[PDB]
Design a protein around this ligand. Structure first.
Ligand SMILES: [Ca+2]
Lengths: 255, 255, 255
């Protein structure tokens, strides 16, 4: 199960039923949980923390030092949860003093060449397409779908159930449930496909749609739009999430 | 020739005059032909089928399972033909039940970081630039030139002798002999450079140009344009290929 | 310090205090200087020349043959200077007969997946973001900052102290001190942040700004603009660099 042609530092903590292929390099100050599969030529570096049930494909590199030139050798981690699919040449750098922990949650698919920068936060249930780049200290909420070659600027946040189209770039926040596409990036309606596929009622889908008509298509400023959403759209946790997300947006939201 | 620092599963079938560098990982249920060069730290996984005369550069990964979450562990292959140049960190995933075979033909250059998704089909004589992403079940016809960072949506088809400019993205078919560029992507004239370089007569080049003036610049709908091309452009296999390609286009063609 | 699980050709020349991790592959006709750190699964190929004080991250490939099909097996090199940070899966191909040497200077950061094509030239003090692609025979002057997923066409040149925004592409030269952004790419003002951060006087910053108002915003052709800059902007090495760079631009400059 553990190949003798892997290099595993004697201090690495490794759980049960872990398969490690040849030419895997595992450093000290590494924690790996149970039921993991680490394929050939993958690299698990100082500071990595890996949960249970993951598969790490060839050439992935977890835990390399930040690409941030503000990094000065401080202790930090790079972490993934459970049941993730970490594809070929995915990079997850460890954190900086700005936070200290780069964290990926559970049940994500990070397609080949995806980059997760220092102090970034990915939730659960996300799909991130080929060679998408998540810059420093970003946040991705649960259940987001991001296509390939997307550029997510530092400190941005993506809401749940968003679909971001391939090749888009953005430096504002993306509120929950929407499609974001075009250049420059833009609100492009609701992720009806994703929501239907996940079992949301047609009624809740229509409410979400109506909230975003108010927000984007009624000529109102943000405050007034959110007031009107609160007054006129049948309330539900989905609608409150839209409102709270926008109302507290650190960067502002995309157009 | 075969390095003792490679890992090669005893069941892998390997042809003659095959050079295998250190830290290459070759699985079972692999077929490799004659006269291949597999460089250091490359990965040839379960289900790979490799022809003759190829060079596989460091960090390439052939045969990993689909990135498609519809994959359920079905048997499939990832295949390349003869005389290809498979550059650094190129990924060619094996197929899904949708087809079962990811296939690359002969005499292609796949530049570093290029991704070939499950069930994709590449023909012969193609050049695909750095980190271009070919999504599920795409088709690339012979002799195409695709630049870097191109995003080719699932189920699309690219015709022969096209040049696609760097950074473009598309979700319709690209008909043969054209330049496709800009954002949003657009017909941008004929690949005169490529056609001249390959020895096409000036007369045939002019006919191709005239067919596309009819198709794109005459205000006609697709049917009427193709009717007029058939009536007015001196017929040749090139012109019939343009017509047939558009007439049977599954997605429609780009603007 | 030198891992026994590395492969190092007996002819490779390796300096003092060099750390080499497991699964590193080092060819013959390689020169490596002092105080280098080469991490796991990196590849240093025939023709590489490495200076002092660098760190080469996992999966980087230095010295592979050109991706140029005009290459016919001629001797060439791939070179880096001192104190560079060469991140995961960075590719630096060796040269062709067009020049013969791919050269990277000192004190650069090349973020993961960056490609440096045959005969390219990078100076000193540059930062090049994730998966940026530098095509054949490009030139990057000192102190440039290039974001992620940038596409730099063959034979282009980037001036010092430029900031190029993420996802941009260009096939003309970028003159010194500017921000280049949008699609299509465009002059987007001065890199005031970068210049201030590096200690340039407010007065010199204002002069640079005034030269570019003349160049881009006064309706003058290139010659007349440069004449007026020479006549009206207080002269300094910065202003002479702007003028000389544009005046001798091989491709023309971006809009
Ligand atoms: Ca790699």
């Amino acid at each position: 199960m553990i190949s003798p042609l892997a290099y595993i530092h004697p201090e690495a903590k490794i759980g049960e039923n872990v398969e490690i292929a040849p030419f895997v390099y595992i450093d000290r100050n590494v924690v790996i949980g149970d039921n993991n599969k680490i394929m050939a030529n993958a690299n698990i570096l100082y500071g990595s923390r890996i949960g249970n049930g993951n598969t790490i494909f060839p050439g992935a590199v977890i835990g390399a030092i930040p690409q941030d030139l503000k990094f000065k050798g401080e202790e930090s981690t790079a972490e993934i949860g459970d049941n993730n699919l970490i594809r070929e040449n995915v990079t997850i750098n460890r954190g900086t003093a700005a936070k200290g922990r780069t964290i990926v949650g559970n049940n994500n698919l990070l397609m080949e060449g995806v980059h997760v920068a220092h102090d970034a936060l990915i939730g659960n249930g996300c799909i991130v397409g080929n060679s998408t780049k998540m810059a420093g200290e970003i946040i991705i909420d649960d259940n987001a779908i991001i296509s390939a070659n997307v550029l997510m600027h530092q400190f941005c946040r993506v809401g749940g159930y968003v679909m971001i189209q391939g090749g888009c770039r953005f430096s504002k926040d993306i509120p929950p449930y929407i499609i974001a596409g075009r250049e420059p990036i833009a609100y492009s309606g609701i992720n009806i496909i994703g929501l239907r596929r996940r079992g949301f009622s047609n009624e809740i889908i229509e409410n979400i749609h109506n909230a975003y008509r108010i927000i984007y298509q009624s000529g109102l400023n943000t405050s007034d739009a959110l007031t009107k959403v609160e007054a006129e759209v049948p309330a539900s946790p989905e609608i409150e999430y839209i409102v709270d997300f926008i109302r507290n947006s650190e960067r502002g939201i995309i157009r």
